[PDB]
Enzyme design. Structure first.
Site, PDB file in Angstrom:
ATOM      1  N   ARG F  54       0.808  -1.197   0.000  1.00 48.37           N
ATOM      2  CA  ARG F  54       0.000   0.000   0.000  1.00 48.37           C
ATOM      3  C   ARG F  54       0.848   1.256   0.000  1.00 48.37           C
ATOM      4  NH1 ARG F  54      -2.692  -0.982   4.125  1.00 48.37           N
ATOM      5  NH2 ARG F  54      -4.315  -2.020   2.892  1.00 48.37           N
ATOM      6  N   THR F  55       1.828   1.307   0.893  1.00 49.46           N
ATOM      7  CA  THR F  55       2.696   2.488   0.996  1.00 49.46           C
ATOM      8  C   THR F  55       3.636   2.687  -0.199  1.00 49.46           C
ATOM      9  OG1 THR F  55       2.652   2.577   3.437  1.00 49.46           O
ATOM     10  CG2 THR F  55       4.540   3.587   2.346  1.00 49.46           C
ATOM     11  N   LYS F  84      21.626  -9.210   4.828  1.00 47.91           N
ATOM     12  CA  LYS F  84      22.327 -10.480   5.005  1.00 47.91           C
ATOM     13  C   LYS F  84      23.845 -10.393   4.951  1.00 47.91           C
ATOM     14  CE  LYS F  84      18.918 -13.410   5.623  1.00 47.91           C
ATOM     15  NZ  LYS F  84      18.794 -14.367   6.761  1.00 47.91           N
ATOM     16  N   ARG F 105      11.789   2.289   3.408  1.00 45.72           N
ATOM     17  CA  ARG F 105      11.080   1.693   4.504  1.00 45.72           C
ATOM     18  C   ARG F 105      12.004   0.566   4.980  1.00 45.72           C
ATOM     19  NH1 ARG F 105       5.232   1.737   5.750  1.00 45.72           N
ATOM     20  NH2 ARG F 105       4.605  -0.166   6.898  1.00 45.72           N
ATOM     21  N   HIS F 134       7.098   7.513  10.728  1.00 45.54           N
ATOM     22  CA  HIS F 134       6.376   7.280   9.459  1.00 45.54           C
ATOM     23  C   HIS F 134       5.819   8.668   9.053  1.00 45.54           C
ATOM     24  CE1 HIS F 134       4.426   5.448   6.206  1.00 45.54           C
ATOM     25  NE2 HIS F 134       3.570   4.638   6.807  1.00 45.54           N
TER      26      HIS F 134
END
Ligand SMILES: Nc1ccn([C@@H]2O[C@H](COP(=O)(O)OP(=O)(O)OP(=O)(O)O)[C@@H](O)[C@H]2O)c(=O)n1
Ligand SMILES: Nc1ccn([C@@H]2O[C@H](COP(=O)(O)OP(=O)(O)OP(=O)(O)O)[C@@H](O)[C@H]2O)c(=O)n1
Ligand SMILES: [Zn+2]
Ligand SMILES: [Zn+2]
Lengths: 152, 310, 152, 310, 310, 310
Positions: F54-55, F84, F105, F134
């Site tokens: 959605r974002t 990693k 994000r 956010h």
């Protein structure tokens, strides 16, 4: 070695780690938790020594080292001189011999060794050889050159 | 009590020549005279932190052949006793209050040794700890050699494949190096050569060894041709192809083999031993595996019973 | 300068930290690397202060401390004194003032903080709350009692 | 027949004070006098719909110590008996036609209770059902308290950690609340406080309890210091850090502990008990685990044999 | 049209010295004078059968900086075209009817050359094919060497790390070997030495190269120190530990370096370049990565724009 | 240049009241008069180390509505840059040589601030960093409150749900607290209460706020009812069941609401807003989501366009 400038006072009973190859002092104090005591301690970092340029010196009071705890300094301050003292007199004077076993302070290089994530003390068999010291981990049984184990 | 009573079995470097003969002598006796009730009432833990079906089934079978009960687990994508958090030390402190002996395999070197420090009086048997040891595989290999050759001294032993990474060949070489007059033939791609530390150990004891490009060069004199699996996953597909060719054994290569000669392989094989070798009198890899049962029974019996009226 | 009734030592030039509480001396030489400097450093631990009983003490040669660096010392050893000693005469006795920003030596207690696996220096916001100084991480912006941060 | 013969063991709320004493009395006897053949010929199912290595190994070991055979499975990412479709009711109707008793752990509350409705005459023993019950953990805990303190009455019991979510502490509190004069100390972050329903139960029976910020406040008087694991996965990393600090036990905290005082923890621990506590005479968490064997043996023996000539 | 117009870009071996120079000159021009509308209306497929975020982003940014549109996919953990069912041949046959060029990375050697046989008039640029080629990484390396050294001839180049398996150091070597007077210094553990075929190639061209144990032996005379990642899985953990020192860089190792020396690394570094090297004037691995966009833009420009109006 | 030109956008706490107003005014203008070529030729990295469809879509649509090109990736279940192996620092160092701005994000708190230290002149906009900030969600919330209420001062705002862990309600609170006369009503289960530090912040600013058991207590006087998702995993299933009613909305609960009251929810709703609320004039969660594009466009415009020709 003396100092005709400012000499640090002696003490009755205790030990004196002389000839500490400067910038190894504090390390000795870290590795072996020498400051985790209440006894009087006196350190001398980066000092004048005609037999090696500069050297550190540690003095711990009412505290002595067995021939083994002294041998444990081997890998760091091999030409050191541990001085047993009492009634202000240097009653004892030993030098670090290479031990056959080094515990707690080294960290195994083998990232897959079980020693890393576990509540156990590292332990290595010491074996001398031309040019270096061979250290074999008690757990993984791998042997490494001390330059790799001590490797920062 | 026997010399192995209540002792941990972690590394071949901890076992003496007499220890080894004691285990193999007990193995032949149990093989000839089964004691299906020797360990009745004993409960043994089969802890495979690292899954290994062939080794676990072998070890569990040995347990049952002596009459003991078994409890345990395999892998850790299912297990909830260390999957993420609890130390191996705590897992052992707990398990050792339940069982009479712990059989364990683990991915990190030294895990079995760490276990003995937390199992109190419960014997720990190492079924493999990363790239370090696999003592019962070595005992089974030695039982097989002794049994087919009648001795562990003065043998011509050829080792083929990945000698660099195989913990199994390193161990067998160390064990055999405890006996006299053994001679070794190492046949491996230079990329997978037998490590210098093993060669040093050998020179140091005056044991003869020599490298060879093909099995062909040693066949006439070999008593035991020990084949290893080539850890392909380590190499390059093109690389593995380029050399595998000269470390694959075919039935025709056994042309001039001695009558007493045996082909061993800890298994699994695949590209190292062609199936046509299976029918010859020399193929002894499946007999080798069946011997893990007698070797592992012996080790359990010796460690759990003071005196074996075997 | 450290006399009672025998041999005593002193430095020509350099700084001198005095009156460090119980076994905070080693910790300060630890955290702030006060011994990384290869100058003539000298330490006293569990020393007899009389005006307390015990304390630690340091001293560096050919090294000086800004009123700033002298501030980072407030969390472990509040009351004390650093002394610049040029020409065998202490030309300055300052005091460690609680700072606004503590960098590099603290470890954020939030395990999910981006600061842990990365090539960055820790950084917190100092803010005393009726004695229980609160620390706010520059990265995750979380705030903890200094008791939790310092615990590790 | 004994009062627990052929009975299901699903919830601590279904067991009376006498039931509990009966299980602990049988446990001490089997611990002192093993009956390795009591359940020979009995087959028991170890059904861990929810994997739990420590509990299963403990329970399976107990089974073998009494001479019974075991069959079963763990987790359901491997299992093909309910992974998606067949009801738990059908799985039980089938299994109960094979075995003499079912030991089961399940992720949903009430699963063991549902099982008794479909197992006919086969006893169901609950090894844990979601956040509801875990009766054998409670029995093992109580056996350990009784054994180290000599009683279950008039004790000072401190419980630390996550009291809100731990099914184990809720259960132990209910069980202890069946005895007299017990006093409780609850030490937990407000976010994980012992639930009001448990406090209500206590007030209702006139049992004293009180909250405390640190163990320090209760150490001089505690008989049993029961530590629980903090369900971190539930909290915020920053949150868990901010409080964990005051619910971690170190060897130095045992400074003024009574000689009879014991530290318990259902395990696994990690950040609640420092390793330095392990060497003190008070650490009894590994002894607690070893007692699960005697508690679980007792429960199996009582449920499967009419009269125990123990 | 320019020499590379509508040409495939599969292997550095298919690119001449002139070609390499044409790409670098074109790349220099675009860096200096951007042309955001050059490939306006072109549609490029960014096909990463094998995922590679760093390489894919670099390449897609270059497409956009020239104004082309992009369609594509990453990691083919399955893909219904090119792995699990459909042949790669059919995947390209279909994809070549949609786009103007295909940029592709694949886990199998020869993948890009194979695509070339099914893409018709659609050019294919190899973004990496197993352990074979990685043309654009080498163009970015050379452009980076040429820009910081003023040339690609008579250079002293050291390559460190996994010279055995690094497809990137193999290509850079071949490319630099098309120029004159380059001197090579290969620093790698014996288990990861520069391949014999690369050495033989160099001997025929009469190019000088030597082997060294560590960086310091040559540090004072190198113009380019090209570091490579030693894949940890390649070696045994202990083997990796006994040898990594000889192949990692710290800023203190830079005291001898020539003022003009730059350190390159195709990234990720982490185990081989300490972060203290970052601030020195020698660190150029990030500027190197940045140059990937100018080299990749050059390539798309040349292959898709008939008359490159430089 | 405008106040936000080339500025990072990490935390609502680094944004002033004027800044917030500048973004909202800019957002109002773009909504009214679109400028599809404003960032023509800009290339933006949409880096979702943590996936959020959605974002991410909202943000990428805003990039395109201004005409910028986009490169990026979602969910880093591994990623060879930023998790990693490679540090996030190196990932940004590389990525900042390719694009004009980075939208990111990440699952770890502080990730965006850390990037800022390695992106050089490349602005970084925080799309979410663990449970920390956010920023763009709050800008979209405020723009939504300002547009439907005519202002951001002297408002009656109710926040419902998981006030404890919702980073979104924490930021909205801080932002609304930079304006004057706002009155807050916090409706949440005790286990999920608005944090003490937020309450303390409000006390210093002298802002009024109260706690309530359910919506109806304040329904007749609220201008904005901001609902949040109560993460089911947070609570125990039974705990969740005993408390959810007090934190869910049905249209029948709207009889008291002021004609001007709007219901917002950052989405997904599902467990907290019944679908019968959808048709009421109060439902504004979808229009709120739609406003995300205007707020996000504003932000990219301001940070990337020196002189914002509004
Ligand atoms: N009460 C005492 C007695 C001895 N020492 C220290 O113990 C060491 C002994 O030095 P010394 O006996 O005079 O022999 P050296 O000349 O130092 O030769 P070496 O260093 O090899 O011992 C010196 O650091 C001396 O200061 C001390 O600090 N306090
Ligand atoms: N050349 C010098 C001169 C002084 N000092 C040290 O400076 C410290 C402080 O001495 P000073 O402040 O001058 O007098 P104090 O009695 O220490 O004042 P106070 O009571 O506050 O400590 C002492 O450790 C002294 O040994 C030193 O190490 N070297
Ligand atoms: Zn080791
Ligand atoms: Zn932080």
């Amino acid at each position: 070695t003396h100092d005709n400038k400012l000499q640090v006072e002696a003490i009755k009973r205790g030990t004196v780690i002389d000839h500490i190859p400067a910038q190894i002092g504090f390390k000795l104090l870290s590795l072996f938790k020498l400051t985790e005591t209440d006894q009087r301690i006196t350190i001398g970092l980066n000092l004048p020594s005609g037999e090696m340029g500069r050297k550190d010196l540690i003095k711990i009071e009412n505290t002595f080292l067995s021939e083994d705890q002294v041998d444990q300094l081997a890998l760091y301050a091999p030409q050191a001189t541990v001085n047993r003292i009492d009634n202000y007199e240097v009653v004892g004077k030993s030098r670090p011999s290479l031990p056959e076993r080094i515990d707690n302070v080294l960290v195994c290089p083998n990232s897959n060794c079980i020693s890393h994530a576990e509540p156990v003390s590292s332990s290595f068999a010491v074996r001398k050889r031309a040019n270096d010291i061979a250290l074999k981990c008690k757990y993984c049984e791998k042997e490494f050159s001390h330059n790799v184990v001590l490797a920062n | 009590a026997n010399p192995l009573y209540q002792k941990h079995i972690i590394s071949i470097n901890d076992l003496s020549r007499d220890d080894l003969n004691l285990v193999l002598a007990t193995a032949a006796k149990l093989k000839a005279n089964p004691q299906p009730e020797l360990l009745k009432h004993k409960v043994i833990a089969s802890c495979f932190f690292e899954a290994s079906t062939r080794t676990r089934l072998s070890f569990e079978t040995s347990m049952h052949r002596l009459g003991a009960s078994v409890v345990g687990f395999s892998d850790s994508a299912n297990t909830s006793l260390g999957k993420k958090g609890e130390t191996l030390a705590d897992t052992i402190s707990v398990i050792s209050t339940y069982v009479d002996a712990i059989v364990m395999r683990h991915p990190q070197e030294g895990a079995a040794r760490l276990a003995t420090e937390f199992s109190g009086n419960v014997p720990v048997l190492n079924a493999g700890d990363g790239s370090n040891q696999h003592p019962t595989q070595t005992l089974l290999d030695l039982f097989t050699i002794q049994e087919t050759q009648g001795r562990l001294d003065n043998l011509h032993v050829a080792m083929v494949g990945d000698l660099k990474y195989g913990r199994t060949v390193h161990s067998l070489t160390q064990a055999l190096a405890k006996f006299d007059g053994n001679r070794f033939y190492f046949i491996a791609p230079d990329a997978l050569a037998m490590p210098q530390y093993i060669l040093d150990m050998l020179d140091e004891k005056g044991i003869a060894w020599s490298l060879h490009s093909s099995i062909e060069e040693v066949m006439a004199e070999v008593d035991i041709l020990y084949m290893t699996r080539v850890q392909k996953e380590r190499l390059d597909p093109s690389e593995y192809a380029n050399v595998k060719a000269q470390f694959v054994l075919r039935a025709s290569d056994l042309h001039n083999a001695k009558a007493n000669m045996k082909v061993l392989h800890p298994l699994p094989r695949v590209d190292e031993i062609a199936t046509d070798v299976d029918k010859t009198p020399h193929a002894w890899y499946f007999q080798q595996a069946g011997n893990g049962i007698f070797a592992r029974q012996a080790l359990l019996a010796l460690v759990l019973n003071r005196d074996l009226v075997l």
